[PDB]
Design a binder for this molecule. Structure first.
Ligand SMILES: CCc1[nH]c2nc(Sc3cnc4c(c3)N(O)C=CC4)nc(N3CC[C@@H](N)C3)c2c1Cl
Length: 193
């Protein structure tokens, strides 16, 4: 399974250089874009955290949390743990840690993984009035041996392109790193223009 991804990351993300590091962001963001395409997500936030980890927040329906007959596991766990808009488990495998929060039906469902391995069963941790999915991951320096430092301009350039290609979407990029905090928000208008 995912152990193959950790041993041959070049086959899954193309490169283990800075290019692969940035590719991880797109693998998660693309899933949020798919949920905007489905018609449910209206806004996506991408955040470079102070430690060069990444948080992606959308306001779509939330990844399904029900048990699948086929697997006996919650659908959300399978998304992150089974190799397959199909790249989430690759990002998981190539991260020291990934945590997912699903905001759905008034509850927050939470699961975390370490180098792709499940920490604990999906659990309800809070109540909520919002809906959507939040994925946070810390890229693995064992994999990304050249650099684990994000390029805000590189991310922002593509976020702007994604806003344009998905006209109507609100999408932002935020840098929370020391001495360089910044945020750019993009939204191209539809027929309301
Ligand atoms: C924050 C990133 C994100 N947001 C996400 N939001 C959703 S929301 C969603 C998607 N598909 C369905 C549903 C929600 N629901 O509620 C019912 C049937 C299908 N799904 C997700 N999945 C499901 C399959 C894969 N594309 C990743 C994601 C992912 Cl990953």
């Amino acid at each position: 399974g995912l152990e193959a991804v950790r041993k041959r990351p070049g086959m899954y993300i193309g490169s283990t250089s800075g290019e692969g590091l940035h590719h991880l962001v797109w693998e998660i963001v693309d899933n949020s874009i798919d949920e905007a395409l489905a018609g449910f997500a209206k806004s996506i936030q991408v955040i470079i955290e102070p430690d060069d980890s990444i948080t992606v927040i959308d306001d779509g329906r939330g990844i399904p949390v029900g048990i699948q007959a086929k697997t006996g596991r919650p659908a959300v766990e399978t998304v992150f743990t089974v190799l397959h808009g199909v790249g989430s488990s690759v990002v998981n495998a190539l991260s020291t840690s990934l945590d997912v929060r699903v905001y759905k039906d008034g509850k927050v469902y939470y699961q975390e993984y370490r180098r792709g391995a499940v920490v604990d069963d999906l659990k309800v941790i809070e109540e909520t009035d919002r809906h959507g999915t939040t994925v946070h991951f810390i890229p693995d320096p064992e994999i990304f041996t050249e650099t684990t430092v994000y390029d805000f301009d590189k991310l922002a350039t593509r976020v702007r392109e994604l806003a344009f290609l998905n006209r109507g979407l609100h999408i932002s990029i935020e840098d929370r790193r020391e001495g360089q905090e910044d945020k750019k928000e993009y939204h191209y208008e539809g027929l309301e223009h």
